Amino acid sequence: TLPLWIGKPGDKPPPLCGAIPASGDYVARPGDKVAARVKAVDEQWILAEVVSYSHATNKYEVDDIDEEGKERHTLSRRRVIPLPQWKANPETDPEALFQKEQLVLALYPQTTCFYRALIHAPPQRPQDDYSVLFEDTSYADGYSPPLNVAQRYVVAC
Numbered sequence: 001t002l003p004l005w006i007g008k009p010g011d012k013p014p015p016l017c018g019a020i021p022a023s024g025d026y027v028a029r030p031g032d033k034v035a036a037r038v039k040a041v042d043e044q045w046i047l048a049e050v051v052s053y054s055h056a057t058n059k060y061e062v063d064d065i066d067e068e069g070k071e072r073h074t075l076s077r078r079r080v081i082p083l084p085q086w087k088a089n090p091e092t093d094p095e096a097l098f099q100k101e102q103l104v105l106a107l108y109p110q111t112t113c114f115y116r117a118l119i120h121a122p123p124q125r126p127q128d129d130y131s132v133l134f135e136d137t138s139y140a141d142g143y144s145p146p147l148n149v150a151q152r153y154v155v156a157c
Contacts, residue, residue, distance in 0.1 A: 002152050004126055005086035005093060013096035018088025018151055020096050027053050028060070028082045035105060035114050035155050036062045037079035045105055045114035048073070065112060081105070087151040090123045097122040098130070098154060106132050107153035116157060120146040130154050
């Protein structure tokens with residue numbers, strides 16, 4: 001589960017704290033969890049684990065983490081979003097949270113998949129989840145009711 005970022009005086013919330021994006025040259029480590037855009041049946045963002053990165057090809061190897069075993073994908077860095085490594089504390093670094101109505105990618109409850117959603121409510125207290133409205137064409141107005149997603153599993157779209 002993710003630690004709260006606790007910065008000292010004059011420290012910016014860092015890359016991968018809450019909504020602060022990774023640096024443009026960033027490379028994730030083996031074992032890091034990421035959102036990975038893979039071909040589906042269509043394309044789909046999935047929860048995945050980094051196996052390696054090659055600087056020669058700018059491609060990761062990632063494993064889809066499923067309860068029956070893992071399936072390997074090889075992906076450009078452009079299809080891999082590192083998850084946050086710290087929660088932003090709403091009480092100290094509120095500006096590092098996604099705000100109401102922002103478009104994000106969020107892990108759908110009880111899945112290992114990410115989908116487009118709008119922020120319904122950011123966390124108000126350090127232990128809180130986001131509340132989001134997932135895009136869902138099964139409903140007339142096209143949105144789920146508010147569903148909880150932890151800071152770990154909400155990334156920029």
